[PDB]
Structure formats: C-alpha cells, structure tokens
Amino acid sequence: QKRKEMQLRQEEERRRREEEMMIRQREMEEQMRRQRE
Amino acid sequence: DGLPEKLAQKNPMYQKERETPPRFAQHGTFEYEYSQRWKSLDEMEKQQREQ
C-alpha cells in the first residue's frame, strides 16, 4: 500500500508536468504558425 | 480609400504592433526621450525646406 500510494503520487506529478509541457508546446506551435502568416 | 484593415493584418507583424494603444508618451520614459530626437529631426528638415 505504501509503494502504491507513492506510485500514484509520482504519476500525478508526471501527468501535471506532461500537460504543462503540452500547453507550452502548443503555445510555441501557435507562435510559429503566426510567424509563417 | 486608404489601407483597409483586411490588407493590414495580412502581414503577421501588424497585429503585434498594436498592443500599445496610441498615446502621448510619458516624461522620463525611453519613448519620450527618443521622441525628442525625432522632433529635432523634423525641425531640422523643416528648416532645410524653408531654406
């Protein structure tokens, strides 16, 4: 149970980091798309 | 019929040049500091034209 709770905490933090990276990448993509305009 | 809005925003830099609203600058700022240089250039051009 202790290992499982630690794994869930790490997974939640990983998902948060991944979604922040995703939104940053989308922002950069939109900026480059505007540049190509 | 001058330059319309549709042709203005085609260039990608036009929209990013309008974030600052039209203003009268502000004493002590860089824009006001260099607007004096621009006004000096305008004045010397006017003097040359009058000559």
Description:
- The PDB classes it as nuclear protein.
- The entry lists the keywords filament, DNA binding.
- This is part of a larger assembly, with 2 copies of chain A.
- With 37 residues, chain A is mainly alpha-helical.
- Chain A has one helix spanning 2-36.
- The termini of chain A are far apart.
- Chain A binds chain B through residues 34-37, and chain B through 10, 12.
List the helices and strands and how they pair.
The structure is cut from a larger assembly and holds 2 copies of chain A.
Chain A: H1 2-36
PDB class: nuclear protein
Keywords: filament, RNA binding, DNA binding, gene regulation, nuclear protein
Entry title: NONO/SFPQ filament: composite structure
Q: Main interface pair? A: A-B, 4 and 2 residues
Shape of chain A: rod-shaped
Radius of gyration of chain A: 16 Å
Give the class of chain A from helix and strand content and strand pairing.
mainly alpha
Observed structural traits:
part of a larger assembly; 2 chains; 37 residues; mainly alpha; 1 helix; 95% helix; 0% strand; rod-shaped; Splicing factor proline/glutamine rich (polypyrimidine tract binding protein associated) (chain B)
